[PDB]
Design an enzyme around this catalytic site. Structure first.
Site, PDB file in Angstrom:
ATOM      1  N   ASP A 148       0.826  -1.195   0.000  1.00 47.65           N
ATOM      2  CA  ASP A 148       0.000   0.000   0.000  1.00 47.65           C
ATOM      3  C   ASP A 148       0.866   1.253   0.000  1.00 47.65           C
ATOM      4  O   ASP A 148       1.950   1.285   0.589  1.00 47.65           O
ATOM      5  CB  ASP A 148      -0.925   0.012   1.217  1.00 47.65           C
ATOM      6  CG  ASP A 148      -1.803  -1.218   1.293  1.00 47.65           C
ATOM      7  OD1 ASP A 148      -1.780  -2.024   0.341  1.00 47.65           O
ATOM      8  OD2 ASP A 148      -2.518  -1.377   2.305  1.00 47.65           O
TER       9      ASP A 148
ATOM     10  N   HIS B 182      -1.166   4.409  -0.145  1.00 45.12           N
ATOM     11  CA  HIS B 182      -2.178   5.255   0.494  1.00 45.12           C
ATOM     12  C   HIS B 182      -1.926   6.739   0.234  1.00 45.12           C
ATOM     13  O   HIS B 182      -2.046   7.578   1.129  1.00 45.12           O
ATOM     14  CB  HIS B 182      -2.258   4.970   1.994  1.00 45.12           C
ATOM     15  CG  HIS B 182      -3.032   3.734   2.331  1.00 45.12           C
ATOM     16  ND1 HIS B 182      -4.397   3.641   2.160  1.00 45.12           N
ATOM     17  CD2 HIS B 182      -2.633   2.539   2.827  1.00 45.12           C
ATOM     18  CE1 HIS B 182      -4.805   2.443   2.536  1.00 45.12           C
ATOM     19  NE2 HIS B 182      -3.755   1.755   2.945  1.00 45.12           N
TER      20      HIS B 182
ATOM     21  N   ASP C 184      -4.399   0.378  -2.940  1.00 46.73           N
ATOM     22  CA  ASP C 184      -4.346   1.300  -1.804  1.00 46.73           C
ATOM     23  C   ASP C 184      -3.272   2.372  -2.009  1.00 46.73           C
ATOM     24  O   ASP C 184      -2.284   2.457  -1.276  1.00 46.73           O
ATOM     25  CB  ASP C 184      -4.131   0.543  -0.490  1.00 46.73           C
ATOM     26  CG  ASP C 184      -5.414  -0.047   0.056  1.00 46.73           C
ATOM     27  OD1 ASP C 184      -6.424  -0.047  -0.677  1.00 46.73           O
ATOM     28  OD2 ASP C 184      -5.412  -0.510   1.216  1.00 46.73           O
TER      29      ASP C 184
ATOM     30  N   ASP D 184      -6.175   6.828  -1.079  1.00 47.86           N
ATOM     31  CA  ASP D 184      -6.884   7.357   0.075  1.00 47.86           C
ATOM     32  C   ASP D 184      -5.929   7.526   1.249  1.00 47.86           C
ATOM     33  O   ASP D 184      -4.848   6.935   1.289  1.00 47.86           O
ATOM     34  CB  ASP D 184      -8.045   6.440   0.483  1.00 47.86           C
ATOM     35  CG  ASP D 184      -9.371   6.885  -0.098  1.00 47.86           C
ATOM     36  OD1 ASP D 184     -10.383   6.190   0.126  1.00 47.86           O
ATOM     37  OD2 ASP D 184      -9.400   7.932  -0.777  1.00 47.86           O
ATOM     38  N   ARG D 185      -6.353   8.351   2.208  1.00 53.13           N
ATOM     39  CA  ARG D 185      -5.631   8.575   3.462  1.00 53.13           C
ATOM     40  C   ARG D 185      -4.219   9.104   3.202  1.00 53.13           C
ATOM     41  O   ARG D 185      -3.214   8.496   3.577  1.00 53.13           O
ATOM     42  CB  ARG D 185      -5.601   7.300   4.311  1.00 53.13           C
ATOM     43  CG  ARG D 185      -6.948   6.606   4.428  1.00 53.13           C
ATOM     44  CD  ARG D 185      -6.916   5.498   5.465  1.00 53.13           C
ATOM     45  NE  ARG D 185      -6.916   6.024   6.827  1.00 53.13           N
ATOM     46  CZ  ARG D 185      -7.042   5.273   7.917  1.00 53.13           C
ATOM     47  NH1 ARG D 185      -7.177   3.959   7.808  1.00 53.13           N
ATOM     48  NH2 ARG D 185      -7.032   5.836   9.117  1.00 53.13           N
TER      49      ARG D 185
ATOM     50  N   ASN E 106      -9.327  -1.992  -2.215  1.00 56.20           N
ATOM     51  CA  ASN E 106     -10.633  -1.648  -1.664  1.00 56.20           C
ATOM     52  C   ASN E 106     -10.892  -0.149  -1.683  1.00 56.20           C
ATOM     53  O   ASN E 106     -12.055   0.266  -1.699  1.00 56.20           O
ATOM     54  CB  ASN E 106     -10.762  -2.181  -0.237  1.00 56.20           C
ATOM     55  CG  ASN E 106      -9.680  -1.657   0.682  1.00 56.20           C
ATOM     56  OD1 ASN E 106      -8.499  -1.669   0.338  1.00 56.20           O
ATOM     57  ND2 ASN E 106     -10.077  -1.193   1.860  1.00 56.20           N
ATOM     58  N   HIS E 107      -9.840   0.672  -1.680  1.00 53.48           N
ATOM     59  CA  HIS E 107     -10.005   2.118  -1.734  1.00 53.48           C
ATOM     60  C   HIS E 107     -10.204   2.641  -3.150  1.00 53.48           C
ATOM     61  O   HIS E 107     -10.595   3.800  -3.314  1.00 53.48           O
ATOM     62  CB  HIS E 107      -8.799   2.811  -1.096  1.00 53.48           C
ATOM     63  CG  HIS E 107      -8.732   2.657   0.392  1.00 53.48           C
ATOM     64  ND1 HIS E 107      -9.362   3.522   1.260  1.00 53.48           N
ATOM     65  CD2 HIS E 107      -8.108   1.737   1.166  1.00 53.48           C
ATOM     66  CE1 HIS E 107      -9.130   3.142   2.503  1.00 53.48           C
ATOM     67  NE2 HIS E 107      -8.371   2.062   2.475  1.00 53.48           N
TER      68      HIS E 107
ATOM     69  N   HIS F   8      -4.819  -7.871  -3.424  1.00 55.50           N
ATOM     70  CA  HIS F   8      -4.975  -6.905  -2.340  1.00 55.50           C
ATOM     71  C   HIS F   8      -5.607  -7.542  -1.106  1.00 55.50           C
ATOM     72  O   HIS F   8      -4.979  -7.633  -0.046  1.00 55.50           O
ATOM     73  CB  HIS F   8      -5.808  -5.717  -2.821  1.00 55.50           C
ATOM     74  CG  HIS F   8      -6.155  -4.746  -1.736  1.00 55.50           C
ATOM     75  ND1 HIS F   8      -5.201  -4.046  -1.031  1.00 55.50           N
ATOM     76  CD2 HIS F   8      -7.352  -4.363  -1.232  1.00 55.50           C
ATOM     77  CE1 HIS F   8      -5.794  -3.270  -0.142  1.00 55.50           C
ATOM     78  NE2 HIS F   8      -7.099  -3.444  -0.243  1.00 55.50           N
TER      79      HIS F   8
ATOM     80  N   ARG G   9     -14.065  -5.316   9.691  1.00 51.83           N
ATOM     81  CA  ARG G   9     -14.134  -4.132   8.842  1.00 51.83           C
ATOM     82  C   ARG G   9     -15.563  -3.852   8.397  1.00 51.83           C
ATOM     83  O   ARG G   9     -16.012  -2.700   8.419  1.00 51.83           O
ATOM     84  CB  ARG G   9     -13.220  -4.304   7.628  1.00 51.83           C
ATOM     85  CG  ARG G   9     -11.753  -4.496   7.971  1.00 51.83           C
ATOM     86  CD  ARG G   9     -10.925  -4.727   6.719  1.00 51.83           C
ATOM     87  NE  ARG G   9      -9.507  -4.897   7.021  1.00 51.83           N
ATOM     88  CZ  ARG G   9      -8.620  -3.906   7.024  1.00 51.83           C
ATOM     89  NH1 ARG G   9      -9.004  -2.670   6.738  1.00 51.83           N
ATOM     90  NH2 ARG G   9      -7.349  -4.153   7.311  1.00 51.83           N
TER      91      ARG G   9
ATOM     92  N   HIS H  49      -3.075  -5.543   2.828  1.00 53.06           N
ATOM     93  CA  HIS H  49      -4.296  -4.931   3.338  1.00 53.06           C
ATOM     94  C   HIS H  49      -4.230  -4.551   4.808  1.00 53.06           C
ATOM     95  O   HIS H  49      -5.084  -3.781   5.258  1.00 53.06           O
ATOM     96  CB  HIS H  49      -5.492  -5.868   3.115  1.00 53.06           C
ATOM     97  CG  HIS H  49      -6.823  -5.196   3.247  1.00 53.06           C
ATOM     98  ND1 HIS H  49      -7.077  -3.941   2.739  1.00 53.06           N
ATOM     99  CD2 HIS H  49      -7.974  -5.608   3.827  1.00 53.06           C
ATOM    100  CE1 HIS H  49      -8.327  -3.607   3.003  1.00 53.06           C
ATOM    101  NE2 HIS H  49      -8.894  -4.601   3.662  1.00 53.06           N
TER     102      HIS H  49
HETATM  103 MN   LIG Z   1      -5.439  -0.124   3.082  1.00 52.50          MN
HETATM  104 MN   LIG Z   2      -6.912  -2.408   1.424  1.00 55.46          MN
END
Ligand SMILES: [Mn+2]
Ligand SMILES: [Mn+2]
Lengths: 293, 534
Positions: A56, A58, A84, A87-88, A116-117, A166, A213, A240
């Protein structure tokens, strides 16, 4: 026609490598080209060794540049990102823009998967939509990125033995033929095989179980062994979960969690790692720390 | 207190239509039951226990003095391998629930039967459909074994207790589609061998058929947890004398529902003493019953009872209130109730209460009265002759109420039996020792069973080893754990590790981390000279 476009791509990459975003038309053309390119790829991208798989990001452009300085330059060595990277993060559009530019420029030298993002309901509640609205003024670059994220492949098969993805395993999936027969050109739902492939997590559970989650299941060691024995695989790479050393082995060296985002959310202060696989399928875990700004 | 009984037997390995086995569905249902019960602001005092189908030393996974962490860790690593020993597991669970009962004072068997000393417990006994085995064949009776009774258990003659309900889940999920979704709001019964055992205790047995039905039964089960006061009613002997507004003709006779004794520990007085005539000299005490056989008679008999008597609000759970609702809930009238089986020296039943309803006509209040109220309520040497009809030990609690007015009695005749006091402290000490021995060896498995038992068909003593899961081979410390393939490279690695002379050396080649990697746990072992004052 081709040489001028290649030079424009090199100029775009050199501009992105200096914390400089592109314009609306440039991002639109890049997303279009990535859409025409990723259409030929299947759900399980057959990646060939040697490679350097990451985890990731991110949306951390400085950490991405640190990773590039550690694990070799992008045009030189191969790269395999497992989602990933949207995001963030304060610099999230620049990271995904550089990644997609390297993909459209080095389609045979770099591979990126879907996380997933990379969706439309997650980027709106984590800041990516806010960053696209603030930087570019309008909300068209975000729309282009979310329309492009549907073309990203799900998993990757390195040397026919390593299975990178992922999320992780799925209860409704028993072989790679089911993954190859999935329609990835679809928004990530709340339930199904793709949701589990993008939201799974390993643990010492044994069997299955609902994940904390909210989406995806949680498999154990026996499930990983059954999946690796019924598909001729020897390892399952994933990214992940947040780790400390950067790489984590689970299920009797069957699952490898590789988190390549140092200082996750700028509050943990951990390290990061990537896995460089040589020609003879020899693995080396290269670790690093967040670069000073 | 909730004791989840998950069999984890070999018959729980068949895959459902969703893709997971029945054991995974049971664990997920337990987790969703946890997250549903956490919504009610009353889950701060309950304690969760786990019981599986294993050997007596290995059946219990988490019992007393076990927090939620170890319980979740044990429920996480449950493996479905073994036979379906339902009777032995139920016996072990009932013995575990009755470890701290003979020491605190609950069910003292000498001073009445106090209903305000409760220890609620709910069993789920999530098992398979049918065809239980006992290592010899397939039985169809489900009889609990009696091989080693606990010291002090012959005074109840039944494994379960005053407040111990038993619900059941069979998980009869089809394998193809589970398309049976005709009845939306309907939860039928399982109709199996566990159904009578559940109905005897006082709890039904659900029949899970679809995930929607599973969610429905779990949402209906969370509303069935309260103080456990289970009493049994009988129609005898009035021949349905309900001739008030219509004519009687019924199934609402053997009501074995529970009662909600909500506190304001529970506060109350005037308990149901016993069902026999206690003698002054009795070495052997007759065994009590977990469910009191108390019977009601439909008589008006001055339902207006107003006095300074201490008040009780043991709310009755509505299960057979149709017979009362047929008579307009008996407005401003009640019916007496009396316990059978020789409540006195020479008589069949003595009315000691009634079942008058409230003004709101919502439920039955279960007005508990003294042993004989219509005489002491309305001294000319009368009380001295009246106190001979009541049981002797019964003068204990009532005198406390007399403390509100005065103190005419004393400890002269406050003696139950000279032989009942004996052989009681030794039984309590034995029960305490057994409970301590059970709680001591509760989590320490120490199996140490890995052998092939090579038969002849160094002699008669050889046994080949088995594959060890958690072996953790020491590659740098032990040279035998280094295979032949990666030997020279590992040799150079060990050489470089030994000749490096670093700090805090280890013998592990690559020990990344465990299954869990917490952020706060790793950040606590650090130092950050910063406070962010701005
Ligand atoms: Mn993540
Ligand atoms: Mn993820």
């Amino acid at each position: 026609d081709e040489k001028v476009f290649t030079k424009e791509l090199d100029q775009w990459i050199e501009q992105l490598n200096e914390c400089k975003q592109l314009s609306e038309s440039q991002v639109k053309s890049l997303c279009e080209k990535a859409k025409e390119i990723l259409t030929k790829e299947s759900n399980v991208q057959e990646v060939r060794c040697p490679v350097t798989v990451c985890g990731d990001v991110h949306g951390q452009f400085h950490d991405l540049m640190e990773l590039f300085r550690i694990g070799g330059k992008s045009p030189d060595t191969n790269y395999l990102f497992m989602g990933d990277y949207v995001d963030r993060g304060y610099y999230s559009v620049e990271t995904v823009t550089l990644l997609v530019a390297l993909k459209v420029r080095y389609r045979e030298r770099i591979t990126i998967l879907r996380g997933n993002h990379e969706s439309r309901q997650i980027t709106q509640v984590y800041g990516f939509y806010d960053e696209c609205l603030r930087k570019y003024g309008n909300a068209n670059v975000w729309k282009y990125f979310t329309d492009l994220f549907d073309y990203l492949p799900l998993t990757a098969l390195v040397d026919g033995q390593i299975f990178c993805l992922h999320g992780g395993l799925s209860p409704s999936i028993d072989t790679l033929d089911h993954i190859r027969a999935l329609d990835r050109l679809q928004e990530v739902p709340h339930e199904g095989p793709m949701c589990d492939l993008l939201w799974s997590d390993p643990d010492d559970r044994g069997g299955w179980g609902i994940s904390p989650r909210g989406a995806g299941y949680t498999f154990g060691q026996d499930i990983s062994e059954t999946f690796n024995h019924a598909n001729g695989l020897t390892l399952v790479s994933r990214a992940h979960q947040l780790v400390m050393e950067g790489y984590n082995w689970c299920h009797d060296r069957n699952v490898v969690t590789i988190f390549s985002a140092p200082n996750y959310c700028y509050r943990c202060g951990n390290q990061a790692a990537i896995m460089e696989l040589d020609d003879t399928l020899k693995y080396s875990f290269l670790q690093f720390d967040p670069a000073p700004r | 207190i909730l004791l989840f009984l998950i069999d984890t037997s070999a018959s729980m390995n068949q895959r459902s239509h969703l893709g997971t086995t029945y054991l995974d569905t049971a664990k997920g249902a337990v987790e969703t039951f946890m997250k549903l019960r956490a919504r009610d602001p009353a889950s701060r005092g309950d304690r969760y226990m786990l019981v599986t189908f294993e050997e007596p030393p290995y059946a219990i996974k988490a019992g007393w003095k076990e927090n939620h962490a170890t319980f979740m860790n044990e429920l996480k690593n449950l493996q479905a391998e073994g036979l379906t020993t339902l009777g032995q597991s139920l016996r072990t669970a009932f013995d575990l629930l009755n470890l701290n009962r003979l020491v605190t004072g609950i069910d003292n068997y000498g001073q009445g039967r106090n209903p305000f000393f409760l220890e609620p417990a709910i069993i789920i006994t999530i098992t398979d459909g049918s065809k239980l085995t006992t290592t010899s064949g397939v039985q169809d009776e489900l009889h609990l074994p009696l091989n080693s009774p606990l010291p002090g258990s012959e005074l109840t003659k039944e494994p379960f207790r005053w407040d111990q309900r038993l619900f059941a889940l069979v998980l009869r999920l089809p394998g193809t589609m589970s398309v049976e979704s005709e009845q939306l709001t309907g939860v039928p019964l399982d109709d199996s061998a566990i159904t009578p055992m559940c109905e005897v205790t006082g709890g039904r047995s659900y029949s899970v058929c679809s995930p929607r039905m599973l969610n429905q039964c779990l949402e209906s089960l969370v509303q069935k947890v309260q103080s456990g006061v289970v009493i049994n009613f009988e129609k005898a002997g009035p021949d349905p004398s309900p001739v008030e507004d219509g004519q009687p003709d019924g199934s609402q006779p053997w009501h074995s529902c529970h009662k909600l004794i909500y506190v304001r520990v529970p506060i109350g007085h005037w308990p149901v003493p016993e069902s026999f005539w206690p003698d002054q000299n009795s070495p052997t005490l007759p065994p009590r019953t977990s469910h009191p056989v108390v019977k009601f008679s439909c008589t008006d008999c001055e339902p207006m009872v107003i006095d300074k008597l201490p008040f009780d609000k043991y709310e009755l759970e509505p299960s057979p209130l149709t017979q009362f609702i047929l008579e307009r809930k008996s407005p401003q009238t009640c019916w007496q109730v009396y316990v059978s089986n020789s409540a006195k020296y020479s008589e069949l039943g003595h009315p000691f209460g009634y079942l008058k309803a409230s003004t709101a006509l919502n439920c039955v209040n279960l007005f508990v009265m003294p042993y004989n109220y219509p005489v002491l309520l309305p001294w000319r040497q009368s009380f001295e002759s009246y106190l001979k009809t009541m049981p002797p030990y019964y003068l204990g609690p009532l005198k406390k109420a007399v403390r509100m007015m005065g103190a005419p009695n004393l400890i002269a005749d406050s003696m139950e039996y000279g032989l009942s006091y004996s052989v009681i402290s030794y039984l309590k000490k034995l029960s305490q020792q057994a409970k301590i021995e059970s709680d001591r060896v509760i989590g320490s498995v120490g199996k140490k069973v890995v052998q092939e038992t090579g038969i002849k068909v160094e002699y008669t003593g050889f046994q080949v080893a088995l594959l060890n899961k958690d072996l953790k081979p020491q590659t740098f410390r032990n040279a035998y754990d280094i295979p032949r393939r990666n030997l020279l490279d590992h040799l150079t690695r060990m050489r470089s590790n030994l000749l490096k002379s670093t700090r805090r050396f280890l013998k592990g080649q690559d020990e990344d981390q465990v299954h869990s990697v917490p952020i706060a746990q790793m950040g606590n072992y650090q130092e950050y000279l910063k406070q962010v004052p701005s």
